Structures are given as C-alpha cells and as structure tokens.
Design a protein around this nucleic acid. Structure first.
Ligand SMILES: Nc1ncnc2c1ncn2[C@@H]1O[C@H](COP(=O)(O)OP(=O)(O)NP(=O)(O)O)[C@@H](O)[C@H]1O
Ligand SMILES: Nc1ncnc2c1ncn2[C@@H]1O[C@H](COP(=O)(O)OP(=O)(O)NP(=O)(O)O)[C@@H](O)[C@H]1O
Ligand SMILES: [Mg+2]
Ligand SMILES: [Mg+2]
Lengths: 331, 343
DNA sequence: ATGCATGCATGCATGC
DNA sequence: GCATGCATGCATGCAT
C-alpha cells in the first residue's frame, strides 16, 4: 500500500520521523520473534535464552518488539496485581577497568526495575537504598556487593518479571584473565537460579566463545541464531529484494527510486543485514529531505555508505562467527 | 579582496590580530565541514564520527566552527528549550599513567556541562557531585568511577546535546595491554549507546588503531578523512596556489610580497596542511611587524620555518596514515567476490 | 543519655 | 617505596 500520500505535504521532519517509526516484518525476523516469544511462554527448565546475531540483523529491535508485546499481554493481568512487573531489560555496561563490574550492574538492575508504586517493597534490606528526595533510586555507595545482590534478589522475587533482558551481553566477556572468565556467566546463572527469573542474553558473535565454555551451558540454555540474509541462497536474495521493494514503496519521496535493481550494491555494504540497510536508507532520505530532492540516485547511496574497509572487517567478523556456528556432534 | 587598508594606521597588535582572526575557506575544509554537518544532523544510530588528519590541518578549527554554527542554529529554539545544551566539547587528557584515566575524563565531562543558572539542572548525581555554592560543579574525590559515570549519563540524557566532541582523541590509545584497546573504546561505545548521544572523535593518525577494533564498532562508526593537499595531483596544487594567493592578499603590510612564486618551498615545509602554512605565515608576519618592514622576504620565511627533520617525521607519519587510509576498486571487487558474484 | 546515622581519617591489599 | 581505591575504624553529631 506504501506510505500515506499526504505526508508529501508535511515538513521534512515529519516524513523523516515516519520512516524511522515504520517497521518491516521480514520473514527471518518473524521466525526469530515467534521462537523467542514461544520460549518465553515456557522456560522448559532452561535458565537462559541466548540470541546472537550479526550486527545490524535486528537484535535490539526484536528485543523492543518483545517488551511491547509482553506489556500488551500483561496489562490485563497487571490490572489485578499492580505490584507484578512484566519485563525488565537493560544494556550491559562495558567496563572501563580490566574486568566487568558486577556491582554497578546490580545497581543498574535495581534502577531498571524501579516501580512508581515503591510502597509495595520499599524495604529490600536497604541501607538507605530506597529513593528519597527524588524519583530515582539512590543506592548507597558503601553498601557491599553481597548486600546489594541480596537486595536485587529480593526485588526480583517480589516483582517477579516474566523475563530479564541483557542488551549487548558481549560486555560480560571482558575480564582481566583467560581463566577468570569461567566465573562470570556461572555467577549470573546462580543469580538466575535463585531468583527463578528467566534471563535472556542478546549480543553479537563475540559471546559465542563465551557461550560454550562447557556442554552444561548448552544443556541449560536455548540458542536463537538471528541469521542474516545470505546471498548464497536465492531465497534470501529474493527476501532482500522484497525488503528493498517495501522500503522503496514506503520512503516518503515524490518519486519512488528504483532501489531493487541495485540490490548487489546494497548487499555489498549491508551484508544481508536489515538494520544496517534501514540506517543507510534513513541517512539517504535525510540527505534528500535536507536537499528537498525528488528522487534518489546512486550517488546518494554512495555518499552515506559505509567505507569498503568497514565492510571488509564486518564481513570477516560475521563469516568467522558463522563458521564458529558449526560445532559438530559428539557422535 | 585583501585586508581593510585602514589597518595600516593601527598598531602592530591590531594588524596581527586581524590576520589571526582571518579564515580561509579552502575547498577540502568546506567538503569535510559539510559532511560533518550532515552526519551530525542525522546520527542514524551511528555511535562514532572519526575525523582524523595530520597535525596542522584544520581539525580543531573545524571543531570550533561546528560548535559555533550549531549554537547559532539552536539559539532560536534555545529561547524555548531552556534545559538543552546544544553542543558540549572536551579535550581528551593525555595521562601520566601508562593507561588513560577515565575518572578525570568523567569529572571534566561534568565540568563541561556547566550552567551558572542551577535551575536548568538542579540535581546531577547521588552525592558529592553538587556545586559548592558556585558555578563550578566540583566533584568530591571519594566519589567512585561507576557512580560518576552514572551521574554523567543522567546529566547527558537530560541536557540531550546534539553531539559530544572529544578533541585530540588519540590519547584513548594509552593502555597497558594490546587487546585491552578494544575495551578502551568499548567503554565509550557503551556510553554512547546508553545515552543516545553521538560522539565525534578528532585526532591525528595515531588513532587509526581504533579504525577496525571490532565489526560492531566498525558498523557504529563513520569515517571522515580530513584530506591534506597532495602535490601529486595538479588539482590540489591549484587549490594550494589559491590559498597562498589569498594569504598574500590578506596579510596586513605596506606591500604584498609574492608568496605564490615560492609555492614549492611552502609545500616542502608544510606538507600541504593549510593550518601549518597559516601558522608559519603568522610567525613571519609577526617578525616583520616587529621589524616594521615593508615587505616579507624569503629570508624571513627561512628564519622561522620548520626544520627538515620535523618535516620528514611528519611526512613519514602521514604516508603511513594515507597508506592505511587508501582504497581501490580492486578491494571492492575482492570483497564482492567473497560475497558472491562480483561486478 | 544512649544508641544510632554519617563523615572523615587511617589502613591495607593491590599494583608496580 | 609510592601510588591507588575500597573498606572500615574511630569519632562526632543527632535526636528522640
Ligand atoms: N526489521 C526492522 N524494521 C524496522 N526498523 C528496523 C528493523 N531492523 C532494524 N530497524 C531499525 O534499526 C534500529 C535498530 O537496529 P538494531 O537491530 O539495534 O541493529 P543492531 O545491530 O542490533 N544495534 P547494534 O547490534 O548494537 O549495533 C532502529 O532504529 C530500528 O528502527
Ligand atoms: N581552514 C583554516 N582556515 C583558517 N585558519 C586555519 C584553518 N585550518 C587551520 N588554521 C589555522 O591553524 C591553527 C589551528 O590549526 P588546527 O586545526 O588546530 O591544527 P591541529 O592539528 O588541529 N592542532 P593539533 O591537532 O593539536 O596539532 C590556527 O592558527 C588556525 O588559524
Ligand atoms: Mg543492536
Ligand atoms: Mg589540533
């Protein structure tokens, strides 16, 4: 059906905002979203759900779509119990020091599950941790790590989120030493087990080595490979062409540019990633709107495209990750 | 058009000040400035803008120009959006320790986001961060780094600056171990992604070690090469001739000396970085004004030029930078062939 | 006036 | 041995 035609009478800002809000439900995304939703609907005794994808494949967008859907689902049940929390999600902070700071992570976890109805669980065993003089929670600096962890466990078991999201969980990987890496993921696992809360990890292929330090991790968790569209298969090429056609039909410009015929050039840079493709089209459309142009030329794509040096490194990284996603059976 | 002739009646300080304030809009600076402007106007999820080039090329001047232009643009809307700070800029501190110190960086970042009017941002952090009844937002020493970072992010998301400027970005390369370099920029990437604030990083080619730290970071970054003029192409030589003619016209003196004739020497001891040429000309003009001479001689230019060893070292660094920064259609075809059929 | 909350002063393990 | 950060120790202030 394309974009609404009346947007052409609107200023450039409105049209640009429209494009950003508009979403493409591509089939790989639908598959991954459905799988993740179904796995959320039934833990099956697995403490972790790992969603690893090539950068730009839609990971964070997927995570967001999941929170919206679960909030829509949980609002009717939230009617009854105000205290219960639907979903908690936060990005893992990359540490500036040698290793991951779990203390700051616990503080930000407590901040994330902050509830306006604080009167339900105003005391987690706190040394002045609860909010005061401001809406935001004021965690006491001198509180030791185990006490903060206990308070976080109490808050989790009180609110009981359906699933706990860690955005860009590749950061957990940073650690001071090769042998000390074994402890982080297992500590997170212990926290998940005691709380009983389903934890989900989203990140790049960097966590793949962090993923399978032993077979126990594979046994106790579920893998969701957010695969990109691969030019090797004509199926993925056709899907990519369909996505390009949808973007051509939905970008707010007077004349729809023929993006489809330049699919090879788009793949060259995007590498089958829809998010990178969407970002590139947003760049080009913003350029055109600021020029008040009428159509998109290949020069427009070239001007805001990623440098071929960037694409080379990106392709090497994703190809290495995909090859790593080939562990064989012990049979 | 030349300098205002009335300046000749003014003292030497005014004559020098006019030339110091004088600016040249040479084409490559305009191209880079336009690209940076357009990228800032649309972050498009990109987390980093890497602007790098040789020493003396115009990068800091660009940082000041974009700051002023964005402030001017946002002022009419700043008349309604009081809490906003359009552009904030800070210079990375070269650390005395073997590794960069993030604590001082965060403290100076908060200091950079300062408004004598406390009303716009009444609360900045947990404790030990509020101002001491003065405009300066002094930070208590015992405040640990993670809480400091949290306060910085809470201040940033409230002020919501369009772009965060980190000048002289090469100091981020100071680290104790090799692959810890990934983690050094990963921290800033996490800050940018959490705060939703686009970071522009400016520095020399020493920062090229950051260029492909990771595929994620490669996607998140945009490269803007501040090209210095290369004598191998007659186009750059023509542009350099135009710049030299403009400087010859605009320097205040009794007569305009023929700087154009000595373009070979100027390129020899400037490597085509117009900032160094401007600075050298300012030095020579200052010498002339101190002598109150009517004209610039080649001897004056020689008296305060750069040493041949310095020029050789600069060229040796620039050659490595450009070699790292080169791309050919053969590389594109090689990439395409790996992907599938290549055209 | 007596226990408790907090802020500053040692202190130590780390880090080198 | 200096430099660094967290932790606690001591001490004072508070307030009921
Ligand atoms: N299928 C999609 N439909 C609509 N918007 C999308 C889609 N995929 C990506 N986007 C847009 O792209 C951005 C999020 O892309 P995202 O999935 O986070 O890429 P990403 O690689 O996961 N981010 P990161 O991994 O940290 O570099 C948002 O602006 C989304 O609107
Ligand atoms: N385009 C320009 N127009 C006018 N003056 C310029 C220009 N570029 C540089 N300059 C002059 O060069 C000096 C600043 O150059 P600058 O951009 O700071 O070089 P720089 O390499 O960034 N300094 P640094 O990086 O610390 O070595 C000032 O004296 C400016 O007047
Ligand atoms: Mg993402
Ligand atoms: Mg400079």
């Amino acid at each position: 059906t394309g974009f609404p035609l009346e947007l052409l009478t609107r200023p450039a800002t409105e049209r640009l905002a429209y494009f950003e809000n508009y979403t493409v439900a591509h089939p790989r995304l639908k598959e991954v979203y459905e799988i993740l939703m179904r796995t959320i609907a039934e833990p099956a005794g697995a403490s972790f759900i790992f969603v690893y994808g090539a950068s730009g494949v839609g990971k964070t967008t997927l995570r967001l779509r999941v929170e919206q859907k679960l909030t829509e689902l949980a609002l009717p049940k939230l009617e009854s119990d105000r205290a219960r929390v639907p979903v908690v999600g936060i990005e893992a902070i990359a540490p500036e020091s040698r290793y991951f700071n779990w203390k700051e992570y616990y503080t930000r976890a407590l901040i994330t599950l902050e509830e306006p109805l604080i009167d339900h669980k105003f005391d987690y065993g706190v040394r002045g941790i609860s909010r005061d003089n401001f809406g935001k929670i004021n965690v006491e600096s001198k509180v030791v790590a185990p006490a903060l962890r206990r308070a976080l466990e109490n808050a989790l078991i009180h609110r009981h989120p359906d699933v706990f999201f860690v955005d860009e969980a590749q950061h957990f990987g940073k650690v001071a030493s090769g042998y000390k890496l074994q402890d982080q993921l297992d500590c997170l696992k212990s926290l998940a087990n005691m709380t009983g809360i389903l934890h989900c990890l989203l990140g790049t292929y960097e966590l793949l080595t962090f993923r399978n330090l032993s077979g126990q991790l594979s046994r106790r968790s579920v893998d969701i490979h957010f695969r990109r569209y691969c030019a090797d298969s004509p199926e993925d090429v056709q899907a990519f062409k369909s996505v390009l056609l949808t973007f051509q039909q939905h970008l707010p410009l007077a004349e729809t540019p023929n993006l489809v015929d330049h699919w090879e050039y788009f793949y060259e840079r995007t590498l089958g990633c829809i998010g990178t493709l969407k970002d590139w089209l947003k760049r080009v459309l913003s350029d055109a709107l600021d020029r008040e142009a009428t159509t998109i030329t290949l020069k427009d794509l070239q001007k805001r495209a990623l440098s071929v040096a960037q694409c080379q490194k990106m392709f090497k990284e994703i190809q290495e990750g995909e090859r790593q996603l080939s562990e064989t059976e012990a049979d």
